[PDB]
Amino acid sequence: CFGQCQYTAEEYQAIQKALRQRLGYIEGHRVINLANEMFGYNGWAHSITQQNVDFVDLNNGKFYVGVCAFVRVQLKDGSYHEDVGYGVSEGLKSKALSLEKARKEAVTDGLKRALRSFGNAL
Amino acid sequence: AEEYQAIQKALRQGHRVINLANEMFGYNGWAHSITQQNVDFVDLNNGKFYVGVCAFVRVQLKDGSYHEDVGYGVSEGLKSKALSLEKARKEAVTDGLKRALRSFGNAL
Amino acid sequence: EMFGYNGWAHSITQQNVDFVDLNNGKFYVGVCAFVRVQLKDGSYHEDVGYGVSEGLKSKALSLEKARKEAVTDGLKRALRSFG
Amino acid sequence: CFGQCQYTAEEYQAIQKALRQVCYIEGHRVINLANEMFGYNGWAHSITQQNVDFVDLNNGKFYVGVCAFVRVQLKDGSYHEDVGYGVSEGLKSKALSLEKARKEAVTDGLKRALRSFGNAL
Amino acid sequence: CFGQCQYTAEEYQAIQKALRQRLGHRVINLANEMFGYNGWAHSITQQNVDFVDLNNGKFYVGVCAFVRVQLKDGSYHEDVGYGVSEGLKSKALSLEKARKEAVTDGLKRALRSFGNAL
Amino acid sequence: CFGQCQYTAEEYQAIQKALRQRLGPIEGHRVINLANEMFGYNGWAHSITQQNVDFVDLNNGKFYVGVCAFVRVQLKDGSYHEDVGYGVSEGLKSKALSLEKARKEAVTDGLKRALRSFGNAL
Amino acid sequence: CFGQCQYTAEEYQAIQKALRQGHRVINLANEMFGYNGWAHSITQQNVDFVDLNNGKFYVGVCAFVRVQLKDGSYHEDVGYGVSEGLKSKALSLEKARKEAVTDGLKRALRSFGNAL
Amino acid sequence: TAEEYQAIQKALGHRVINLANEMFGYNGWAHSITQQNVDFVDLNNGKFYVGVCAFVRVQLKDGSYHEDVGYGVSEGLKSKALSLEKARKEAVTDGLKRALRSFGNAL
Amino acid sequence: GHRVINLANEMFGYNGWAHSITQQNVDFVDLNNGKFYVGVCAFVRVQLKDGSYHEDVGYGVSEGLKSKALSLEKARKEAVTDGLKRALRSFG
Amino acid sequence: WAHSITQQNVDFVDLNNGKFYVGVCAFVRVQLKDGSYHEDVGYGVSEGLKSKALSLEKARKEAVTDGLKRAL
């Protein structure tokens, strides 16, 4: 099953050389496509380990919100990483909208930052 | 086995997304669940309801490959608790399940 | 319903009462139940059951029937995924 | 799976031989260095706990300070841990101060936890 | 697998002889040289800010950390490092110094329990 | 694996005879050295099960500190021992130094006392 | 491993026969069981009370000094210890707890037979 | 194994301990203090006064176990700690006596 | 004497049955005239080698007694013994 | 069969004129050898008793019986 398989030497080396094709910045969907092509559709998973809210203030009618969320990224073999995402949704004037924005931006930023460690190609 | 190449290349290309997933991954080959849910807040200021909820969803395939994402639902202006919590705690699940399947490929 | 309660099974993962109100003079109750449907082929899903009773006489009367309705609705809606 | 397979003699010799070869270590270079030295399938990395110390608000600034614990691990079974400490100052919006502190802490922890496997890192 | 392995007799005696010699970065380097990078591990089981006093502007900090050291055989060791701090006019820096010195001293002390060569 | 394996008969008799003898010539370092030589660097472990600060006070510009500790030795065979060490400090001007001394002497005293249970040699 | 080995019949009978007959108790237990025949641990310890009459402290501590044996049989027993006259609180608690542990170790060990 | 049970069935201060040792063997029975509660303390006229309870427990080789609740008091003493010491020790001994009594006519 | 104890011992065997105490709480004691009353509950328990078990409840009483020790000890013993009698009756 | 008392609470203790009145409610449980189980909370009161001791003795039995007759 996922997280318990092993790769072949030649494909392992091909992937290893692929991941170092370094550029030398947010492209949310494009990172999903890149991962799908470099590890396959059936290659990677990511869970939201935790999600806490730091502050929901109403200073001047305008809201201010802060959400921090830890995300985890795993590859078919069983290796894993983890990083601290963080989304901010200041400015809005409908608590539901600020919560939408922060809670959906923190996860994406975390998935971006947790995927730059498997290689420099991402 | 050969179907692996077919699915991988095909992925490279509303409620209809559920049937789309059933056709693409097989109508017996995709599952989901709700790992957690939290009524975020309820408030009234002018005799009306603003109910929001955050709901996490999970999706896994036949071989165990999985993903997750945050779902969210909102409803404003409704008179009673019944309808507002008929709407938000009802649509957050679908919104999350829509935003989770997009991660598996462009075709979704 | 081709197979019925033999090709698929159900169970409430968790339930919690949302709100109970009496400002109107009668019991206003809202309940939620999470049901999961599992198939013998390994496919499974889950949906948020939900039921409500408005302005009934007693807490138990407004709560038990609302719970039954919520479970029935959750079962009814959880079966969409096999369409 | 990860953390269970054991090296072969030549691999162990190579890695050991490699690892032996006031300003900080520039930060992000360590991820590339470690990835090339152990491999992408080589190691893992996790945050076992993260906790927030004072968030004071003197004279309108914000001084968030966070602490972190970073577990590194090689596929052979070894592991390590260390304590990192983000900081902040001057930022006028708690969103930015929290962001800076929380993000800096984990990188610092990863650096100080990789430094324990040798001098080269 | 780490913890489930047992040293080989010849290497076991070799290490026995090694650790009986007569002599922060130095300690870690020496531990790596003897046991090897694969050889051992290091964990932090608990921590606690003992006191965070504020006398006259300075920030007197104190952190107690229990560091565990372990070897692929299964041997444990634990000790109590205490990282003092003093004189700093900014709270964050004082807490940083204390929390780092704590684990450093803990590792030092917990390693001495193995042999005199440390 | 340590803690799940028994001693070998010849080593058993050697250890038995060695422990029964008596010191010829206690300070902490020598106990550590003798224990190491007696079992090696691989024959045991020591850990702190609990450590509560019994009291900390002040009387005219100083700190009478005191701490407790529950050390615990163990041997490859599974036998174990425990004992309550106890530390003290007087006249120190700074709280940090007093807590330092107390916490540090506690564990070493506990180690000496817990080891002593095995034989007269120590 | 400790807590799972069965006693060899000859050793069982020998220890039983020798059973029908503090530093002293520690040594005797070590010789009768061997250096790896038993273990001892502190299950709980709660300062029963403290006090101060005229600058001299009073202390009291309880200890449930579990003492175990290779075959798996075990005993526990309430200990106790006390101090008086001592002018320093830390010294008082040190003496009290140190004596309580050994008193419990005695009373527990003085149970497997008249030998102890 | 059944022979030991049959022999015990046919058969059924320090004397209770000695009888238990002779009856079950040095490894035949354990005893542990499940809980201890101090029910009062008094300072009437300089003489302390205390009683304690303890849910002593016993076990045999095959796992069959019992339990009970003893009690001991202390009067006429001058030092509190001495009072509690005697109370706890006597309570444990008396509870053990009652637990052993529970097992049969032999005890 | 508590003949029920001996009867159970002879019927099931000394290892055939068991005993336990699950919780005990003094409902009250009062200083009515210096002859304190005492009656204390006790969640007794009993089992058997076959697995079938029966919890129960008991409540002894300490009639007027000038001695606290006698009252408390008598209550604590009587509660357990009466509960044991009750549970044994259920076993049959 | 087996039964247990997993919670219990005396509701009312009362006295009119040297004659006590009391109320209790106990949380009984049951089980069966086949793995199935039954459960029913009960209730019990004692009225017009000479001593509080008798009332407190009686109420627990009445509550336990009320729960058990239903659950069993």
Q: What is the DSSP string of F31-45?
A: HHHHHHHHH-SSSEE
Enumerate the H helices of E1-118 as residue ranges.
9-18, 25-35, 91-112
Which letter does DSSP use for residue G37 in this model?
S
CA F51 → CA E108, F66, F85, J11, distances in Å? 20, 11, 10, 44
Chain D residues near residue A12 by CB distance under 8 angstroms: 41
Q: How many whole angstroms separate alpha carbon G102 and alpha carbon G29?
A: 13
Q: Are I43 and I22 in contact (CB under 8 A)?
A: yes
Query: Does residue D2 belong to the interface with chain E, where contact is any CB pair within 8 Å?
Result: no
**C-alpha triplet B60, B64, B68: angle, nearest 5°:** 35
Q: How many whole angstroms separate alpha carbon D6 and alpha carbon H94?
A: 60
Query: Does residue B39 belong to the interface with chain C, where contact is any CB pair within 8 Å?
Result: yes
Which CATH number is G9-109's, of 3.40.50.300, 3.30.390.80, 1.20.1260.10, 3.40.50.720? Answer: 3.30.390.80
Q: Are H26 and G19 in contact (CB under 8 A)?
A: yes
Q: Which residues contact I66 (CB under 8 A, 6 or more apart)?
A: I34, I35
Q: What residue type is assigned to position I37 of the chain?
A: Y
CB contact under 8 A, E78 and F48: yes
Helix axes F9-20, F28-39, angle to 10 degrees: 150
CB contact under 8 A, D39 and A55: no
CA J52 → CA I59, I82, J10, J20, distances in Å? 12, 19, 13, 6
Please give the CATH architecture assigned to the domain spanning A9-113. Answer: 2-Layer Sandwich (3.30)
Query: Does residue H102 belong to the interface with chain G, where contact is any CB pair within 8 Å?
Result: no
Q: Are E41 and E78 in contact (CB under 8 A)?
A: no
Enumerate the H helices of chain D as residue ranges.
9-19, 29-38, 94-114
Nearest to D61 by CA among D100, D31, D32, D29: D100
CATH class of H2-101: alpha beta
Min CA distance, G69 vs chain F (Å)?
9
Q: At the topology level of CATH, where does D9-117 sit?
A: Enolase-like; domain 1 (3.30.390)
Query: Does residue A74 belong to the interface with chain B, where contact is any CB pair within 8 Å?
Result: no
Nearest to E40 by CA among B38, D74, A104: D74
Q: How many whole angstroms separate alpha carbon F43 and alpha carbon F11?
A: 12
Q: Which of I15, I19, I69 lies closest to H73 in CB terms?
A: I69
Nearest to D97 by CA among D69, D55, D45, D59: D55
CB contact under 8 A, G93 and F66: yes
Chain E residues near residue D89 by CB distance under 8 angstroms: 92
Q: Which two tokens stand for residue E12?
A: 């076991």
Strands H65-67 and H48-60: antiparallel
CA C25 → CA A85, C29, E102, G28, I75, distances in Å? 48, 12, 63, 80, 51
Please give the CATH architecture assigned to the domain spanning E9-112. Answer: 2-Layer Sandwich (3.30)
Tally: H helices and E strands in chain D: 3, 3
Q: Which of D43, D47, D95 lies closest to A66 in CB terms?
A: D95
Nearest to F45 by CA among D80, E69, E16, G39: E69
Q: What residue type is assigned to position F101 of the chain?
A: K
Report the Cα–Cα distance between both ends of chain A, in Å, rounded: 26
Helix axes G9-19, G23-33, angle to 10 degrees: 150
Which CATH number is F9-116's, of 3.30.390.80, 3.30.70.580, 3.10.450.630, 3.40.50.1580? Answer: 3.30.390.80
Q: Do chains J and A touch (3 or more CB pairs under 8 A)?
A: no
Which letter does DSSP use for residue G78 in this model?
B
Q: Which residues contact E116 (CB under 8 A, 6 or more apart)?
A: E19, E20, E21, E22, E23, F33
Strands F44-48 and F80-89: unpaired
Q: Are B91 and A20 in contact (CB under 8 A)?
A: no
C13: buried, middle or exposed (CB in 10 Å: 19+, 13-18, 0-12)?
middle
CB contact under 8 A, E12 and F42: yes
The helix/strand/coil state of C42 is coil
Q: Which of B15, B28, B55 lies closest to C41 in CB terms?
A: B28
Q: Which of C13, C30, C43 lies closest to B81 in CB terms?
A: C30
For residue J34, count other CB atoms closer than 10 A to its CB.
6
Residue E37 Rama label (left phi>0; alpha psi -120 to 50; beta): alpha
Evaluate the CA torsion angle A9, A10, A12, A16 in order and state its sign. positive
Query: Does residue F82 belong to the interface with chain G, where contact is any CB pair within 8 Å?
Result: yes
Nearest to B68 by CA among B78, B59, B77: B59
CB contact under 8 A, G2 and F78: yes
D31 φ, ψ to 5°?
A: -65, -45
Break positions in chain G: residue before each gap, C to N over 2.5 angstroms = 21
- G touches which chains (3+ CB pairs under 8 A)? F, H
Q: How many whole angstroms separate alpha carbon F52 and alpha carbon F69?
A: 7
The helix/strand/coil state of D13 is helix
CB contact under 8 A, H12 and I14: yes
Query: Does residue E115 belong to the interface with chain F, where contact is any CB pair within 8 Å?
Result: yes
Measured in angstroms, the resolution is 3.2
Q: Do chains H and G touch (3 or more CB pairs under 8 A)?
A: yes
Rg (CA), chain I: 15
CA B32 → CA B17, B55, B101, I14, distances in Å? 14, 13, 10, 56
- Most distant CA atoms of chain A, gap in Å: 61
Which letter does DSSP use for residue D62 in this model?
-
Q: Which CATH superfamily is domain B3-104 in?
A: DNA repair protein Rad52/59/22 (3.30.390.80)
Q: What residue type is assigned to position A78 of the chain?
A: G
Q: Are F65 and F120 in contact (CB under 8 A)?
A: no
CB contact under 8 A, A117 and D35: yes
Query: Does residue B104 belong to the interface with chain A, where contact is any CB pair within 8 Å?
Result: yes
Q: Which two tokens stand for residue E94?
A: 């004082």
Task: Calculate the dihedral angle through the C-alpha atoms of E67, E70, E75, E81, rounding to the nearest 10 degrees.
Answer: -20
Q: How many whole angstroms separate alpha carbon D59 and alpha carbon D54?
A: 15
What is the 3 state secondary structure string of B26-59? CCCCCEEEEEEEEEEEEECCCCCEEEEEEEEEEE
Q: How many whole angstroms separate alpha carbon A68 and alpha carbon A102?
A: 9
Q: What residue type is assigned to position A5 of the chain?
A: C
Tally: H helices and E strands in chain C: 1, 3
Q: Which two tokens stand for residue B22?
A: 């059933």
Q: Which residues contact G66 (CB under 8 A, 6 or more apart)?
A: G40, G41, G42, G43, G74, G75, G76, G108, H32
Report the Cα–Cα distance between both ends of chain B, in Å, rounded: 22
CB contact under 8 A, J53 and I37: yes
> Chain H residue with minimal CA distance to I15?
H64
Q: Are C26 and C57 in contact (CB under 8 A)?
A: yes
> Chain D residue with minimal CA distance to A85?
D103
CB contact under 8 A, H69 and I14: no
Element (H, E) at G65: strand G57-69
CB contact under 8 A, I41 and J33: no
Element (H, E) at D72: strand D66-74
Q: Which two tokens stand for residue G93?
A: 């608690």
Q: Are F105 and F73 in contact (CB under 8 A)?
A: no
Q: Are I13 and I48 in contact (CB under 8 A)?
A: no
Chain J residues near residue I43 by CB distance under 8 angstroms: 5
CB contact under 8 A, A120 and D3: no
Please give the CATH architecture assigned to the domain spanning C8-82. Answer: 2-Layer Sandwich (3.30)
Chain G residues near residue F81 by CB distance under 8 angstroms: 39-41
CB contact under 8 A, H36 and G78: yes
CB contact under 8 A, J60 and I59: yes
Q: How many whole angstroms separate alpha carbon A31 and alpha carbon A53?
A: 26
CA I50 → CA D15, F107, H62, I53, J1, distances in Å? 62, 50, 14, 9, 12
Element (H, E) at F114: helix F95-116
Chain F residues near residue E15 by CB distance under 8 angstroms: 41
* Cβ pairs A/B, distance under 8 A: 65
What is the 3 state secondary structure string of I34-77? CCCEEEEEEEEEEEECCCCCEECCEECCECCCCCHHHHHHHHHH
CB contact under 8 A, G51 and H80: yes
Please give the CATH architecture assigned to the domain spanning I3-91. Answer: 2-Layer Sandwich (3.30)
> Which residues are E85's β-sheet partners?
E61
Min CA distance, F100 vs chain E (Å)?
6
E40: buried, middle or exposed (CB in 10 Å: 19+, 13-18, 0-12)?
buried
CB contact under 8 A, C21 and B93: no
Nearest to I63 by CA among I51, I74, I52: I74
Query: Does residue B82 belong to the interface with chain C, where contact is any CB pair within 8 Å?
Result: yes
